[PDB]
Amino acid sequence: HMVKVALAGCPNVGKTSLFNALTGTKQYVANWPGVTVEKKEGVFTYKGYTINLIDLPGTYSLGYSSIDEKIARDYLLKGDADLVILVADSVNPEQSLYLLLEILEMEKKVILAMTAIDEAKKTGMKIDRYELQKHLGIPVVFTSSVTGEGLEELKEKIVEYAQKNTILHRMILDYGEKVESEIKKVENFLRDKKLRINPRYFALKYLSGDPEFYSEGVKLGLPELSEEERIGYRLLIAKRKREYVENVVKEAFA
Numbered sequence: 001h002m003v004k005v006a007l008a009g010c011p012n013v014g015k016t017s018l019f020n021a022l023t024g025t026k027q028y029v030a031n032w033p034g035v036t037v038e039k040k041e042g043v044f045t046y047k048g049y050t051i052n053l054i055d056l057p058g059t060y061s062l063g064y065s066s067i068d069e070k071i072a073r074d075y076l077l078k079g080d081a082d083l084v085i086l087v088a089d090s091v092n093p094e095q096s097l098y099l100l101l102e103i104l105e106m107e108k109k110v111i112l113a114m115t116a117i118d119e120a121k122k123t124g125m126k127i128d129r130y131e132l133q134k135h136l137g138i139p140v141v142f143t144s145s146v147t148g149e150g151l152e153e154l155k156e157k158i159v160e161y162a163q164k165n166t167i168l169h170r171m172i173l174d175y176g177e178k179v180e181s182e183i184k185k186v187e188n189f190l191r192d193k194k195l196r197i198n199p200r201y202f203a204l205k206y207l208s209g210d211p212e213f214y215s216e217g218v219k220l221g222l223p224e225l226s227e228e229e230r231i232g233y234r235l236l237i238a239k240r241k242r243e244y245v246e247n248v249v250k251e252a253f254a
């Protein structure tokens with residue numbers, strides 16, 4: 001019984017440390033196809049399940065311009081992982097949570113690993129794990145590569161949540177009447193197409209001028225957008241995500 005897992009996260013949040021802690025010496029070097037960027041893969045067993053762990057290049061966000069974000073995003077959207085672990089810096093969680101929302105809009109299964117929880121405790125931070133699960137709709141595990149906190153529970157959660165396919169997660173962030181109308185237009189236009197991607201996600205990246213999806217959207221016959229229109233959609237979407245994240249932090253962090 002094999003489970004394929006990807007580690008996603010911003011640069012310098014503690015992904016490598018968590019990767020090492022989970023896999024030990026059972027890891028291997030290789031290259032991603034077509035680039036020189038190192039691909040790290042590791043293996044660990046848990047209750048007779050065998051987990052293959054891929055560490056993705058660090059990404060502040062999941063655009064499509066830098067080679068690291070191309071690699072990571074292509075894997076997330078087009079790859080074969082059964083679930084993803086979003087590794088977040090517990091101490092300064094804002095950018096990590098923004099990255100998470102991006103993944104949730106792709107409609108992939110994700111576990112939130114709030115790592116460096118030892119530095120959170122040390123600095124007097126109070127993080128409500130159940131408030132996080134409530135606003136994010138996914139399993140949350142507090143981890144520390146320094147203390148070992150949560151490592152085993154994360155392994156348990158990986159096999160448990162990989163086997164839980166009856167109850168699904170759904171995020172729909174309301175972007176306001178205007179952006180929602182345009183999303184509706186785009187979904188209705190792609191309704192009879194063979195999108196290998198979530199249409200709401202497709203529409204969002206198209207409106208905001210994503211290099212991949214804006215270009216593909218136009219290909220499929222959607223209207224071209226001015227620089228001002230793309231800049232404006234991108235800003236509105238970003239602002240709404242930031243607002244949601246600020247509310248999550250408000251509710252879950254004391």
Ligand SMILES: Nc1nc2c(ncn2[C@@H]2O[C@H](COP(=O)(O)OP(=O)(O)O)[C@@H](O)[C@H]2O)c(=O)[nH]1
Nearest residue numbers: 011012013014015016017115116119144145146
């Ligand atoms: N306090 C604390 N520090 C950590 C933890 N995990 C990683 N670090 C430190 O955070 C820095 C970045 O960690 P690293 O694994 O290289 O992050 P990466 O860039 O995401 O691969 C390093 O200095 C680590 O020593 C943790 O759980 N607790």
